[PDB]
Amino acid sequence: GKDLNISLPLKTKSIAPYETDVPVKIGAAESLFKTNDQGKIEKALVKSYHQPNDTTLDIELKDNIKFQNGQKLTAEKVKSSLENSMKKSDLVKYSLPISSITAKGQKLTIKTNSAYPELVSELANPFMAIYDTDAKSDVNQTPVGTGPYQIKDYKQSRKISLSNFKDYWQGKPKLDHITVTYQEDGNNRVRNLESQKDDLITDVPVNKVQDIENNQNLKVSKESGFRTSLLMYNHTNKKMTKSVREALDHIIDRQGIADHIYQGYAKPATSPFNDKIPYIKEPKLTKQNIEQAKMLLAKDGYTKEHPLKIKLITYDGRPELSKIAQVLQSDAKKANIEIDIKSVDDIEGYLKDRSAWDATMYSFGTIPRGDTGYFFNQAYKKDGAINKGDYNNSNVDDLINQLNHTVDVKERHNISNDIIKLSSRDVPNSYIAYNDQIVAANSKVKNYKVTPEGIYLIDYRTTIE
Ligand X SMILES: N[C@@H](Cc1c[nH]c[nH+]1)C(=O)O
- Catalog residues that contact ligand X under the rule CB under 6 A: 10, 21, 317-318, 347-348, 362-365, 386
Residue 272 Cβ vs ligand X, minimum distance, rounded to whole Å: 11
Structural contact between residues 40 and 375, judged by C-beta atoms closer than 8 angstroms: no
Q: Would you say 387 or 423 has its CB closer to ligand X?
A: 387
Q: Would you say 244 or 455 has its CB closer to ligand X?
A: 455
Q: Could you tell me which of 12, 10, 38 has the C-alpha nearest to residue 451?
A: 38
Dihedral angle computed from the Cα positions of residues 293, 298, 304 and 307, in that order, rounded to the nearest 10 degrees = -90
- Which helix (H) or strand (E) is 104 found in, with range? strand 98-104
Residue 111 Cβ vs ligand X, minimum distance, rounded to whole Å: 26
Residue 336 Cβ vs ligand X, minimum distance, rounded to whole Å: 30
Tell me how far apart the alpha carbons of residues 353 and 388 are, in angstroms, rounded to a whole number: 10
Residue 25 Cβ vs ligand X, minimum distance, rounded to whole Å: 9
Task: DSSP for 105-147, please give it.
Answer: TTEEEEEESS--TTHHHHTTSGGG-B--TT-SS-TTTS---SS
Residue 317 Cβ vs ligand X, minimum distance, rounded to whole Å: 6
Structural contact between residues 354 and 101, judged by C-beta atoms closer than 8 angstroms: no
Q: What is the largest CA-CA distance in the chain?
A: 72
Residue 101 Cβ vs ligand X, minimum distance, rounded to whole Å: 24
What's the distance, CA 434 to chain centroid? Answer: 13
Count other Cβ atoms within 10 Å, centred on residue 393: 17
Count CA atoms closer than 13 A to 434's CA, side-chain side.
21
Residue 361 Cβ vs ligand X, minimum distance, rounded to whole Å: 9
Q: Would you say 347 or 420 has its CB closer to ligand X?
A: 347
Bridge partners (DSSP) of residue 218 are 442
